[PDB]
Amino acid sequence: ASALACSAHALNLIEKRTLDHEEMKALNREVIEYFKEHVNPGFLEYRKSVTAGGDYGAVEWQAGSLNTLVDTQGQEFIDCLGGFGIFNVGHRNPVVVSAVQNQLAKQPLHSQELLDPLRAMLAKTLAALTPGKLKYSFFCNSGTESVEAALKLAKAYQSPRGKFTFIATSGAFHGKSLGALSATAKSTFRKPFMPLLPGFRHVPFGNIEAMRTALNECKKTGDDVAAVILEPIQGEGGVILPPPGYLTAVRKLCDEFGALMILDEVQTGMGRTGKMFACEHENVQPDILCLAKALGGGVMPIGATIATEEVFSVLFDNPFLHTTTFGGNPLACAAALATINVLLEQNLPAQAEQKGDMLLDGFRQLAREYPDLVQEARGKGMLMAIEFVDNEIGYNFASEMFRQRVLVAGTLNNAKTIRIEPPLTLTIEQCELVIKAARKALAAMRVSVEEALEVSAKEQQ
Amino acid sequence: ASALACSAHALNLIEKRTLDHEEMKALNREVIEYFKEHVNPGFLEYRKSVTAGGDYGAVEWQAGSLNTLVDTQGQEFIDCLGGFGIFNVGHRNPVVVSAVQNQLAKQPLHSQELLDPLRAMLAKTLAALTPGKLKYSFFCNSGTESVEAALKLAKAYQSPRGKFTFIATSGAFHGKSLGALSATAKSTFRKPFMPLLPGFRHVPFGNIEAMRTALNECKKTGDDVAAVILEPIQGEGGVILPPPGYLTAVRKLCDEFGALMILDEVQTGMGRTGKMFACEHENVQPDILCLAKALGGGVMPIGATIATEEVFSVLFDNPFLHTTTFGGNPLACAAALATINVLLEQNLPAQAEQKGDMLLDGFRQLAREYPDLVQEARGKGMLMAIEFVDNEIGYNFASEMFRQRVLVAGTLNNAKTIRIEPPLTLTIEQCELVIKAARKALAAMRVSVEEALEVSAKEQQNAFYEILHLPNLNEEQRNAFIQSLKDDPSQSANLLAEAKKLNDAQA
Amino acid sequence: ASALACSAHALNLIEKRTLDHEEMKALNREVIEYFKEHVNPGFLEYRKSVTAGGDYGAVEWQAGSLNTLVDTQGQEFIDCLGGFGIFNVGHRNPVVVSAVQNQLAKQPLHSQELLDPLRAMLAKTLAALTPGKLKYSFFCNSGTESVEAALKLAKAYQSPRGKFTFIATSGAFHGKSLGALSATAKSTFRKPFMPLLPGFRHVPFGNIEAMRTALNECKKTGDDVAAVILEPIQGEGGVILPPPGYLTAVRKLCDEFGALMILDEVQTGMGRTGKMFACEHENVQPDILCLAKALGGGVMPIGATIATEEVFSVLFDNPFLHTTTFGGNPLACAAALATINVLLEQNLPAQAEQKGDMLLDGFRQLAREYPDLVQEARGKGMLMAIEFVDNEIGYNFASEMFRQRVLVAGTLNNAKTIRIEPPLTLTIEQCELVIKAARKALAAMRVSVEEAL
Amino acid sequence: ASALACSAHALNLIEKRTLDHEEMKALNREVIEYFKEHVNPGFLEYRKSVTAGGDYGAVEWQAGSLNTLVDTQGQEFIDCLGGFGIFNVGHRNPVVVSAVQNQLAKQPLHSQELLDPLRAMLAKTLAALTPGKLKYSFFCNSGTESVEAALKLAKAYQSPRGKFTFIATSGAFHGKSLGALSATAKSTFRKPFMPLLPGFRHVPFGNIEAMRTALNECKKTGDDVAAVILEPIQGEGGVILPPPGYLTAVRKLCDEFGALMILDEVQTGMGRTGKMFACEHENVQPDILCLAKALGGGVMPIGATIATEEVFSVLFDNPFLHTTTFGGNPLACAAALATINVLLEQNLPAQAEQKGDMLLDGFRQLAREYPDLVQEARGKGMLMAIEFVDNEIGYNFASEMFRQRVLVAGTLNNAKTIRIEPPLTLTIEQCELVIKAARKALAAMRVSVEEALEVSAKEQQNA
Numbered sequence A: 001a002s003a004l005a006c007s008a009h010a011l012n013l014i015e016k017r018t019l020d021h022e023e024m025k026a027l028n029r030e031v032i033e034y035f036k037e038h039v040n041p042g043f044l045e046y047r048k049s050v051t052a053g054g055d056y057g058a059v060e061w062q063a064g065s066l067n068t069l070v071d072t073q074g075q076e077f078i079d080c081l082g083g084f085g086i087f088n089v090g091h092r093n094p095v096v097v098s099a100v101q102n103q104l105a106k107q108p109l110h111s112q113e114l115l116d117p118l119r120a121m122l123a124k125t126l127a128a129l130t131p132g133k134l135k136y137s138f139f140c141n142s143g144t145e146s147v148e149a150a151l152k153l154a155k156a157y158q159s160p161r162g163k164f165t166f167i168a169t170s171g172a173f174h175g176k177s178l179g180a181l182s183a184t185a186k187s188t189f190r191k192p193f194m195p196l197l198p199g200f201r202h203v204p205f206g207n208i209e210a211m212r213t214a215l216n217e218c219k220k221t222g223d224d225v226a227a228v229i230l231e232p233i234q235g236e237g238g239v240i241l242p243p244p245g246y247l248t249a250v251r252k253l254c255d256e257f258g259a260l261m262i263l264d265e266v267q268t269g270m271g272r273t274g275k276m277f278a279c280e281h282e283n284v285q286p287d288i289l290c291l292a293k294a295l296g297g298g299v300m301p302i303g304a305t306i307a308t309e310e311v312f313s314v315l316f317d318n319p320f321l322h323t324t325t326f327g328g329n330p331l332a333c334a335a336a337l338a339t340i341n342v343l344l345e346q347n348l349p350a351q352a353e354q355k356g357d358m359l360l361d362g363f364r365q366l367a368r369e370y371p372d373l374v375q376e377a378r379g380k381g382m383l384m385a386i387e388f389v390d391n392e393i394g395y396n397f398a399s400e401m402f403r404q405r406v407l408v409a410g411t412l413n414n415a416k417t418i419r420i421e422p423p424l425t426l427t428i429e430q431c432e433l434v435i436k437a438a439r440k441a442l443a444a445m446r447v448s449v450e451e452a453l454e455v456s457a458k459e460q461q
Numbered sequence B: 001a002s003a004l005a006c007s008a009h010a011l012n013l014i015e016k017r018t019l020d021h022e023e024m025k026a027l028n029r030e031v032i033e034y035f036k037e038h039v040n041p042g043f044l045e046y047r048k049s050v051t052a053g054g055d056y057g058a059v060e061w062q063a064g065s066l067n068t069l070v071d072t073q074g075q076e077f078i079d080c081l082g083g084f085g086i087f088n089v090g091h092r093n094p095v096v097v098s099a100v101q102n103q104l105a106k107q108p109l110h111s112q113e114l115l116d117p118l119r120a121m122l123a124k125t126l127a128a129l130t131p132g133k134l135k136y137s138f139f140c141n142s143g144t145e146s147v148e149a150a151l152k153l154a155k156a157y158q159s160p161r162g163k164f165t166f167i168a169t170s171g172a173f174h175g176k177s178l179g180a181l182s183a184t185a186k187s188t189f190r191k192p193f194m195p196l197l198p199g200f201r202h203v204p205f206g207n208i209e210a211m212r213t214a215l216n217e218c219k220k221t222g223d224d225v226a227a228v229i230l231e232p233i234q235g236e237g238g239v240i241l242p243p244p245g246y247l248t249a250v251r252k253l254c255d256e257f258g259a260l261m262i263l264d265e266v267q268t269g270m271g272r273t274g275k276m277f278a279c280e281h282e283n284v285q286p287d288i289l290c291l292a293k294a295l296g297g298g299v300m301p302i303g304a305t306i307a308t309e310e311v312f313s314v315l316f317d318n319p320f321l322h323t324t325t326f327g328g329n330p331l332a333c334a335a336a337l338a339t340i341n342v343l344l345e346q347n348l349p350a351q352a353e354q355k356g357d358m359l360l361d362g363f364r365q366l367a368r369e370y371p372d373l374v375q376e377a378r379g380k381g382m383l384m385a386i387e388f389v390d391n392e393i394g395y396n397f398a399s400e401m402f403r404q405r406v407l408v409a410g411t412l413n414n415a416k417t418i419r420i421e422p423p424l425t426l427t428i429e430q431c432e433l434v435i436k437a438a439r440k441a442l443a444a445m446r447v448s449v450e451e452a453l454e455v456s457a458k459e460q461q462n463a464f465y466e467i468l469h470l471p472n473l474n475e476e477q478r479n480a481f482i483q484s485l486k487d488d489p490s491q492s493a494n495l496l497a498e499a500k501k502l503n504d505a506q507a
Numbered sequence C: 001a002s003a004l005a006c007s008a009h010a011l012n013l014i015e016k017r018t019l020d021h022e023e024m025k026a027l028n029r030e031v032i033e034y035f036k037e038h039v040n041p042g043f044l045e046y047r048k049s050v051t052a053g054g055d056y057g058a059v060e061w062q063a064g065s066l067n068t069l070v071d072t073q074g075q076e077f078i079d080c081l082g083g084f085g086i087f088n089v090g091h092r093n094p095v096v097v098s099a100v101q102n103q104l105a106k107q108p109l110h111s112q113e114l115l116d117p118l119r120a121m122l123a124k125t126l127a128a129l130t131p132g133k134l135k136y137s138f139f140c141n142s143g144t145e146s147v148e149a150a151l152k153l154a155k156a157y158q159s160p161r162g163k164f165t166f167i168a169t170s171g172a173f174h175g176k177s178l179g180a181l182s183a184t185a186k187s188t189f190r191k192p193f194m195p196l197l198p199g200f201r202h203v204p205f206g207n208i209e210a211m212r213t214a215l216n217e218c219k220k221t222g223d224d225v226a227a228v229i230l231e232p233i234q235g236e237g238g239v240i241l242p243p244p245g246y247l248t249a250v251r252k253l254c255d256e257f258g259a260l261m262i263l264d265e266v267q268t269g270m271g272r273t274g275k276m277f278a279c280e281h282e283n284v285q286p287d288i289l290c291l292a293k294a295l296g297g298g299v300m301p302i303g304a305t306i307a308t309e310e311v312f313s314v315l316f317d318n319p320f321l322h323t324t325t326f327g328g329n330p331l332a333c334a335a336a337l338a339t340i341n342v343l344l345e346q347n348l349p350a351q352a353e354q355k356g357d358m359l360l361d362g363f364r365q366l367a368r369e370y371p372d373l374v375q376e377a378r379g380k381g382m383l384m385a386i387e388f389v390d391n392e393i394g395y396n397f398a399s400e401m402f403r404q405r406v407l408v409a410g411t412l413n414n415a416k417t418i419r420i421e422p423p424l425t426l427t428i429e430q431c432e433l434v435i436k437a438a439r440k441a442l443a444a445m446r447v448s449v450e451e452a453l
Numbered sequence D: 001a002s003a004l005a006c007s008a009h010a011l012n013l014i015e016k017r018t019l020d021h022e023e024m025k026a027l028n029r030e031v032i033e034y035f036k037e038h039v040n041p042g043f044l045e046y047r048k049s050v051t052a053g054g055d056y057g058a059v060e061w062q063a064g065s066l067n068t069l070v071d072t073q074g075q076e077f078i079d080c081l082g083g084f085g086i087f088n089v090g091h092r093n094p095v096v097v098s099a100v101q102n103q104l105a106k107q108p109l110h111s112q113e114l115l116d117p118l119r120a121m122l123a124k125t126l127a128a129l130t131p132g133k134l135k136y137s138f139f140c141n142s143g144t145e146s147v148e149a150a151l152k153l154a155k156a157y158q159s160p161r162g163k164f165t166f167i168a169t170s171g172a173f174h175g176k177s178l179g180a181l182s183a184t185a186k187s188t189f190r191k192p193f194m195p196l197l198p199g200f201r202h203v204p205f206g207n208i209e210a211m212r213t214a215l216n217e218c219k220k221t222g223d224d225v226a227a228v229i230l231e232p233i234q235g236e237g238g239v240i241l242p243p244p245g246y247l248t249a250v251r252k253l254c255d256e257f258g259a260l261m262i263l264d265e266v267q268t269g270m271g272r273t274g275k276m277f278a279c280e281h282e283n284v285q286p287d288i289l290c291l292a293k294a295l296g297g298g299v300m301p302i303g304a305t306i307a308t309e310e311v312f313s314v315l316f317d318n319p320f321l322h323t324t325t326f327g328g329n330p331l332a333c334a335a336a337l338a339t340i341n342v343l344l345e346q347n348l349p350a351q352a353e354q355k356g357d358m359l360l361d362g363f364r365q366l367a368r369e370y371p372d373l374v375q376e377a378r379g380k381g382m383l384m385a386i387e388f389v390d391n392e393i394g395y396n397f398a399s400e401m402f403r404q405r406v407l408v409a410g411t412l413n414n415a416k417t418i419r420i421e422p423p424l425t426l427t428i429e430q431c432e433l434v435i436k437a438a439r440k441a442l443a444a445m446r447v448s449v450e451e452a453l454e455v456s457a458k459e460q461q462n463a
């Protein structure tokens, strides 16, 4: 068809709230054809590996309740994926939806010349919400943009001081824009795109001595380290918790060598680990803090890079040194201001702690019961993972859970590991249903394995 | 206060549609204090340079009509800034607002595990809307992200073919993320952040022979070019139009050397130049096309990177090779689908042509009338610029226009140049009001100058010769001070003082 | 065998001045086996492509006269290869051999702690010999080392000034050490070894406007140029002469943008183009000058990097910033001091001019006569090339010349192009014999072709 | 003057074997003026810091015996500097001088088109002399060129295998050419010349776990290691001996990750540590071995890069991929062939062991006696160092030794550390004279210190 015809057919679909069997069958059939012909036929192959065929062709339609998703066939899913840590305050949180709706009625995007007042308000808010000397905020549209901004603040601070080297950690995930991907550590994500930014070096996560070595060797050779960047807990790494005091030691180590400390709280921020930021567990103040995902309330894309006056002041003489067109737009600021208001009003950080403790205990118990399938369960607050024995078992679990209308998925920088990242608003009853679904899934998986194994050993001579 | 207290005070402000004198005075005072203490005190200094004091402290409040903005004091501005090419279909275009409102009621952000249907629909739409073999779309949240995606598609296609070098053009602006900024060409934007991506080289824009040379020399030395990236017309460069046929020649040149052609239509896309894409003027099909700004309808942030099946197929075996969390979200897709529907239904590309022709004629005439102030006016469709004689005159114009409630601003990779980028929906009457405002501004500027001052010729010529004779400067330094002096004759006293200092210092 | 046994057999061979048929046959057979098993079996394949089989297995033995080489079978060759521009003052120039012999009797290599007096003397000599404000000399062991030193002087001068980009030219050859190879321009020499030094960009040779563009674009993007490096005439490029005034323009262009001018006279230096340095043709003073090959007199390996006090003074606060163990050794300095003495005493620069004019005229005439085989002949002084129509014809010429006991070979950054780089001491009679050999070679090549059909 | 005039005056000086007081005074005065005006006035400042003035202006004239140097004033020095590890077989070793003299009479430099037979002979010799599967030799003119060749062999082998990262060690010294300097580890030698080759990372020397980490992390991030390069013992680092088995472990570690092992034996090679190569102590076979300094016999500049057929075969299809004009020249080959013959015939590796053990014991004993001045003495064979308490004490020792006509000097990647690198041919009596000179030097230094202190205290009491 013409573009006009397709743009029309699609606006008509946006208005529709419901689909009869025929409208559903037609839309499902279209979305699969169009993913294949215009988006990525690879996404259809992946979703098959993590489903029992026919289930891969599930099409999102609307939010059910705070903690559920409904497909085009009316099937309601409990959300333990949380859009990879976006939906901290649930799906269509009425307070966030309200703030966005209200700003949409006045001015959704700004001129970038007149002072936009929600930018000023969210910056003031984030300054009050953040620890210590974190004071200035730069707004962008994603995690990867927030990391680019951080790397850039560090570069501008440190190049006149003669420092250009950056240290990241293996298993680390900081985004996929080429500046961010220089810090991202997974080989398969980096190799095609090399050469990446020069002067990026990786040490093991949670190993302070390896990091000391790297900083010291860089100092010896005249390749002095501008910054260390790390996640307080590695998400895509498979929920990798550092040894206690590690973050505090990295801060002293950065202080000693005159390197800037960059904390990537894109995925651990906005209450998910049981505090507003995972750096609050140790009362660690980085030089630069990166936020996205949940900051937009599961309604708007937004990122934020917050830094000390000492570091951020690099942008004061020429405020156009770093810019973006959409960053700090009124819809996004409204969504973030709502999200902070919701998390604080309802003490959802405290809820994440209680519910995470409850869920992790549940999973650790299933791990004890199914060591043939599960290596270990880890977490902190509502950031959790189950590591299975091998990759194919992890995929069978994702499918079994999906069959039972519970939504989980794999981690990026870690195969065979399933993230459990539900909304902080997940109810105690849903928490219990999740554990029962997990149990039913593991029992079904054990049968599959035992069956196969008989149907194999038969082969001999 | 607590964060809770500030988040509350701010949600209260989001609900309010009106401000009495007291609410306005209190909010203005807050926004200025908070910009200074938590955003950037630099932005307050810049806005002063481009206003008569008290005017710098104008605070955005809401959209007036399709083509106007209203501050906290109720002053309505005609928008010739267009948010730097975002507001193609105007402020709160009811069709776009409607689509976003409708999708917000179902699902604003997606899971990233279930197939999201608006992604599929917008991708199908963009495939039909785009020229030739452009077929696959990757959605992100900004121009800079769309450029990163393009660079990444090229890298993945070309590294197994042994090609790693990228060519961009001087004056070029492709974004500020470190991959994008490797292609961005302005010194002041790059130097603090070097070293940038290796293998990035710059040729003059609109010079096919310089580009041939660069590709050929790279081939000779074994540093073969993976891709050429260029804007069809340089926006931040100051609306720099290439010679006609240039784009067509770059395409044949890329075809000959086996390099991928990347077109950055972030700022020339969605009808702004008089066609849906500026590559349609010459019927040029790039390998990879970058879109953002206007694609979101002035409601949502979105970027799109569209490419051939041949190039994009690099993402098919591992679909996680390039991803983003928010990219291709349902709100953004709804906003884009609406925007395309609006541009096509109302033939706004055709309107941009007519209104741009009208506005450019107006500006070229004011240029004829005020050669003491204006060097030249250029444009294509509703992408236009006025180059003034010097930077300070450009700033005086922006201020005079703002005094008269018409919103313009400067370009990034070009000082003393004012962009005129109004909504394609600007009415013929507003077009005329814009020209009258410009005229009034230039007349007032002439008076300011003529306020017992203007001539300074020999005053300048004296500085040229004194600077040239100072015996302790090297030839790069003398050359840097004389380029400053002829480029901006109104700083001859300042530049002379500076040169005398450094001459004394090398005795 | 043991190493002791092989080191013994070889010292025995070094003492021998003559080989009977049996000693020759045994040594030839050994050298081919050992090239194959321990050096490079590739060198044996190349030498075959540029010979009529049996001729590829020629083994160097000794210098004949100033301008000839003798193989193990006693066959004497007129040398028009000149070891690629080493043998400017001939083979075993008695004045150079004498100086080396004399220093070998006192101290061949230095301590690197006591002031070594020939270093001081050769540096003083090179300062007097070089144009203008070229004053300080750093001694190394090769062309590539002399270029590394130049690149390093530029880096140390310009990094505190915020400039890091370097411009070289396509067809350019500056050596094969990884710093030098970043400036070297031929793809097949660079691709395996990438990534090379960052911030190295190439413009066409002899195109001042292309170079202006590159400097200007680098300035616009904040990647300002530290230095331009170029050969005054590209040797490995195939004897590529720049347009007149080009070098002078590059100097003004460097002056304007505040970039350092590096001239690589490794192959055009020590009189080969008709002056002591090719930069003297236009009276061009670079910031940094690179020398090797002929500077050692065809006896010693040496390189020299000479620069202004302004640039070299980067090494004054810490004189260990750039060092080499063997560089500026007394044998090498003795050899260079002798070589300069010989070139000046006998006005061999002037001879190179006259003999090059004579030889080039001869070749241009053969080009007129054999356009089926020869595209063109070029040169300046005793730096000359014949470009053939295609690569295989160039190889047939090298072979035909070798069959007639005249030694020529191909260029590096240019196929199908044969360098003629004889000693400046080549006699007028030899010059004429060379032209007659070339004629006989082309006539035989024409027959081969006409045959084939 | 004209260049002709100076080239003449200098050839006149090359012929002279003797200088009366007037010829000496005139030549010394010239050499100092010319170092200042045309070489480096910095060399004159450095040599002052390591002498009592008047002594800084000592000018080399000729070799005395195998193990001594004579200045323009006829003062004979015992050589414990060894030209930083060049003079393994002494000054003007008659066997080396003979081979060079003999080849000079036939063909000193080659055409580079005809097969040069000494290249073939030295390559065959070095193949027999080297351990295991080391088979192919490429000849150059210096240590830094030999390292460039190694880096290049690795790059050509490993880039088609998708590996581009190189690991070196801190304190490491591999040369000053920009490829080599990318592996060299001292800050002050690198910073002015950055950016250097990309893909170069440094681990601590003698720390196998730090190196494992680096290889593993590079593998995880897709920046896989092409090669490890290290000295078996760091010379410029200040004679840093790795823990025993380190080299063996690095070899297994390289084998595990598929990285090439490059051993830089430029300074530990040709018998200096008590074996022909320091890699023979642990029977470690690297993929690529680098040689220079002593390989030329203290007569000729030469470097050699030797590698497996597996690695070197990258140069077989295009033999012009890596070349040099002077490399593998007949004089240099003659000098190297002589040097190998001398080292093997006279078992100088075994002598280096015995004499080094003797000298190191002597120094360790002086360390016990002078802990106020000396931190420690280390070595292996005739590769030795004395670390002093502070830099200025190190310089006072170098001066005191020079005053007593014994030649020592500092290390590059280590201040306050004096290298003792005498010819392997140093006689037992000279060994003893060296120890006595060291003793006399330390005793004089102690008196200087003790005197200062006495002067201070009395002035104070006097108040």
Ligand SMILES: Cc1ncc(COP(=O)(O)O)c(C=O)c1O
Pocket: A084, A141, A142, A143, A144, A145, A147, A173, A174, A175, A176, A231, A235, A236, A264, A265, A266, A267, A292, A293, B323, B324, B325, B326
């Ligand atoms: C720790 C971390 N950093 C950065 C990102 C990238 O965020 P975005 O996809 O919005 O660019 C992610 C997303 O998964 C993340 O988990």
Ligand SMILES: Cc1ncc(COP(=O)(O)O)c(C=O)c1O
Pocket: A323, A324, A325, A326, B084, B141, B142, B143, B144, B145, B147, B173, B174, B175, B176, B231, B235, B236, B264, B265, B266, B267, B292, B293
């Ligand atoms: C041509 C072009 N590309 C890229 C960008 C950057 O887009 P964003 O600001 O959305 O990152 C701009 C912004 O002005 C632009 O004009």
Ligand SMILES: Cc1ncc(COP(=O)(O)O)c(C=O)c1O
Pocket: C084, C141, C142, C143, C144, C145, C147, C173, C174, C175, C176, C231, C235, C236, C264, C265, C266, C267, C292, C293, D323, D324, D325, D326
């Ligand atoms: C211009 C130029 N530079 C550098 C070199 C390299 O000299 P070497 O082979 O001694 O390193 C050459 C050799 O042909 C040359 O012609």
Ligand SMILES: Cc1ncc(COP(=O)(O)O)c(C=O)c1O
Pocket: C323, C324, C325, C326, D084, D141, D142, D143, D144, D145, D147, D173, D174, D175, D176, D231, D235, D236, D264, D265, D266, D267, D268, D292, D293
């Ligand atoms: C171990 C080592 N490698 C390399 C070099 C550099 O060798 P050259 O000075 O011959 O360039 C040296 C010199 O001191 C060295 O000791």
